[PDB]
């Protein structure tokens, strides 16, 4: 468990090219598509997204903890077969290095992992739900934003007028 303080900034050039980079660890992200995959997003009255408020790198282990803790809540509330879908839109393309094992001699790091670069204002997660379940997705997102670096905004992108009043 290396701290994200090491990896969270965009200070480095984009390092994505697998033709030049070997030994890249697999992603810990289980699924990018959750709930009912056979159903269209547009079948739902309500669309809610988690928006990242600062440009950052979110590493794959953090994406998974975040996704997990959100989807686990939906499953616990709406039920395993519950009617909704959640998308994790970002993929961890940026490869991460650590200079481990000499000091600063030949310091270029070995490959330790992956992160997703997210610009401020982007949708990280988008969930589609029925009006009755909307407070359950808000709650899932609250748990999710606690597991990633940046402060987040929770936004209802469709059917807000239907919500509460």
Partner RNA sequence: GCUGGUUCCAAUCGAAACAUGUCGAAGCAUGACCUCCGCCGAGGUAGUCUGUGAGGUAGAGCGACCGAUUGGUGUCCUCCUGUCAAACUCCAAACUUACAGACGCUGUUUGACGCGGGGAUUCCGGUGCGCGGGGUAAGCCUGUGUACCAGGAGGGGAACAACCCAGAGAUAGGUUAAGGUCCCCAAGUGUGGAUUAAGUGUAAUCCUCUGAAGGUGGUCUCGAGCCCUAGACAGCCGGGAGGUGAGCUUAGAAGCAGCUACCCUCUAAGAAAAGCGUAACAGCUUACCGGCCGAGGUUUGAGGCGCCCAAAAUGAUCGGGACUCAAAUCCACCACCGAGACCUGUCCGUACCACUCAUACUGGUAAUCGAGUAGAUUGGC
Partner RNA sequence: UCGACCGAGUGGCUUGCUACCUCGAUGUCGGUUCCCUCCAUCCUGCCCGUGCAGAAGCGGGCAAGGGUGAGGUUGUUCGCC
Shortest reach from residue 30's CB to RNA, in Å: 10
> Among residues 45 and 111, whose Cβ is nearest to RNA?
111
Applying CB under 7 A, which residues contact RNA?
1, 3-6, 8-9, 11-21, 27, 31-33, 37-38, 59, 61-62, 64-66, 68-69, 87, 89-91, 93, 97-100, 103-105, 107-109, 116-118, 122-123, 142, 145-153, 164-165
> Which residues, in sequence order, are CB contacts of 144 under 8 Å at separation 6+?
50, 66, 67, 69, 70, 125
Task: Measure the CA angle with vertex 153, ends 151 and 158; round to 5°.
Answer: 160
> Among residues 126 and 130, whose Cβ is nearest to RNA?
126
> Which residues, in sequence order, are CB contacts of 156 under 8 Å at separation 6+?
46, 47, 48, 134, 163
Phi, psi (5° rounding) for residue 65?
-55, -40
> Among residues 12 and 76, whose Cβ is nearest to RNA?
12
Shortest reach from residue 55's CB to RNA, in Å: 11
Query: How far is residue 62 from each of residues 108, 115, 153, measured CA to CA in Å?
Result: 24, 9, 18
> Among residues 17 and 81, whose Cβ is nearest to RNA?
17
Shortest reach from residue 12's CB to RNA, in Å: 5
Shortest reach from residue 125's CB to RNA, in Å: 10
Query: How far is 70 from 83, CA to CA, in rounded Å?
Result: 15
> Among residues 78 and 92, whose Cβ is nearest to RNA?
92
Query: How far is 98 from 107, CA to CA, in rounded Å?
Result: 9
Shortest reach from residue 4's CB to RNA, in Å: 3
């Amino acid at each position: 468990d290396k701290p994200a303080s090491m990896y969270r900034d965009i200070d480095k050039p984009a390092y994505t090219r697998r033709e030049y980079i070997t030994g890249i660890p697999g992603s810990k992200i289980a699924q990018h598509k959750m709930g009912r995959k056979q159903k269209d997003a547009d079948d739902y009255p309500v669309q809610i997204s988690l928006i990242v408020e600062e440009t950052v790198q979110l590493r794959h282990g953090s994406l998974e903890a975040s996704r997990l803790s959100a989807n686990r809540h939906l499953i616990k509330e709406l039920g395993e077969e519950g009617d909704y879908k959640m998308t994790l839109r970002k993929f961890p393309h940026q490869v991460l290095r650590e200079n481990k094992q000499d000091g600063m001699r030949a310091a270029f790091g070995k490959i330790v992992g992956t992160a997703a670069r997210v610009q401020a204002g982007e949708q990280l997660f988008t969930a589609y739900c029925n009006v009755e379940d909307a407070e359950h997705v808000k709650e899932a997102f609250r748990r999710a934003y606690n597991k990633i670096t940046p402060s987040c905004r929770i936004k209802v992108e469709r059917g807000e007028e239907l919500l509460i009043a």
